[PDB]
Amino acid sequence: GEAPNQALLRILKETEFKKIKVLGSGAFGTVYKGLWIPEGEKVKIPVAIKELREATSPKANKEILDEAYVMASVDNPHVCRLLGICLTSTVQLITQLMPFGCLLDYVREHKDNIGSQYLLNWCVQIAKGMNYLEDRRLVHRDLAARNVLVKTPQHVKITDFGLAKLLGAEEKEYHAEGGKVPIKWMALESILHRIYTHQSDVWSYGVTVWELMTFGSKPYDGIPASEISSILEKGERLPQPPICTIDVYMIMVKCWMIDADSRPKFRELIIEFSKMARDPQRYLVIQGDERMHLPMDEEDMDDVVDADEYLIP
Numbered sequence: 461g462e463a464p465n466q467a468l469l470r471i472l473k474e475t476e477f478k479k480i481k482v483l484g485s486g487a488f489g490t491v492y493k494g495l496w497i498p499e500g501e502k503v504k505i506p507v508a509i510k511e512l513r514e515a516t517s518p519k520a521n522k523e524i525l526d527e528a529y530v531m532a533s534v535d536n537p538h539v540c541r542l543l544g545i546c547l548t549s550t551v552q553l554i555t556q557l558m559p560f561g562c563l564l565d566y567v568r569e570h571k572d573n574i575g576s577q578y579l580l581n582w583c584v585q586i587a588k589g590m591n592y593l594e595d596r597r598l599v600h601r602d603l604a605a606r607n608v609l610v611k612t613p614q615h616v617k618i619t620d621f622g623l624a625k626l627l628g629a630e631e632k633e634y635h636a637e638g639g640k641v642p643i644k645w646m647a648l649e650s651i652l653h654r655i656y657t658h659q660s661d662v663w664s665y666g667v668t669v670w671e672l673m674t675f676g677s678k679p680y681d682g683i684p685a686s687e688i689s690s691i692l693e694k695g696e697r698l699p700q701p702p703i704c705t706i707d708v709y710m711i712m713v714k715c716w717m718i719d720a721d722s723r724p725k726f727r728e729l730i731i732e733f734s735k736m737a738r739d740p741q742r743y744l745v746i747q748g749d750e751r752m753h754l755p756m757d758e759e760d761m762d763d764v765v766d767a768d769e770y771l772i773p
């Protein structure tokens with residue numbers, strides 16, 4: 461069968477954490493910011509510390525440690541990695557501090573200062589992260605703008621491995637059981653049949669790109685989740701965002717095709733968005749795109765792609 465997972469689960473003493481201040485609480489438990497000073501070494505590492513709503517539940521530590529397992533096994537610049545766990549009564553997961561927060565809130569707060577270059581770069585980076593997960597045979601099952609974090613405005617990473625599952629070594633799908641799920645980011649075949657593939661993640665990527673291009677709009681705003689599968693069966697989809705050229709919207713629509721193998725692959729999404737990122741104003745139309753601030757080969761140029769963006773399976 462599958463190859464041995466030789467990742468290191470690092471256990472971190474509680475005396476190594478300092479300046480602990482709360483970032484947010486409620487639905488996802490409680491998230492703190494802090495500093496991590498490892499024992500012998502003269503370094504201070506900004507970190508975020510996650511932990512469920514106080515509690516001591518045996519059902520809860522099972523899910524937390526499933527997340528830790530996945531998050532400890534990933535090493536990519538566009539995926540968040542687990543630094544370690546701390547073994548308090550409910551288990552604490554420790555990761556890198558992402559000072560700018562989640563990408564959904566970032567695009568909402570900075571609507572009027574986000575240029576086309578940033579939007580298309582984020583799309584590339586998210587596609588790189590997702591392609592990496594695909595190479596590790598992992599199906600995320602919860603890709604959305606709320607689950608992308610911002611290290612800097614130039615550098616985002618995918619997070620939230622709570623729902624992630626391994627698509628088998630010889631197998632090509634996953635069949636799920638009960639729980640709560642985000643209907644509005646899900647492929648049709650996931651809603652009806654609980655089938656989950658790399659290609660169901662591509663659907664979710666489409667919806668994530670739509671959220672970014674609409675500067676944080678709620679998909680299918682007003683429509684209740686029980687209606688969504690009927691809407692999608694009729695052939696309705698999310699509308700073309702104001703800023704989007706047909707080129708960009710056509711990529712989104714391809715992610716929402718009924719036949720899953722007709723959707724783009726993450727590797728192709730990397731290529732397409734990377735091309736668009738070299739001439740951003742040709743693909744997104746944003747008022748005041750020159751005045752945007754945040755903290756002969758010319759015949760060839762159309763289809764030029766750097767080798768770093770041309771990825772082999």
Ligand SMILES: C#Cc1c(-c2cnc3ccccc3c2)c2c(N)ncnc2n1[C@]12CC[C@](NC(=O)c3cncnc3)(CC1)C2
Pocket residue numbers: 483484485488491508509510553554555556557558559560561562565609619620
């Ligand atoms: C969820 C989370 C999260 C994570 C994270 C994710 N997954 C994790 C998995 C394992 C272990 C740790 C994990 C940590 C995170 C982070 N690493 N670094 C900065 N922030 C983060 N957040 C946020 C918590 C509150 C927040 N921001 C605001 O509420 C806000 C800010 N400014 C004005 N208004 C509102 C939205 C998400 C930042």
Ligand SMILES: [Cl-]
Pocket residue numbers: 714724728732
């Ligand atoms: Cl394509």
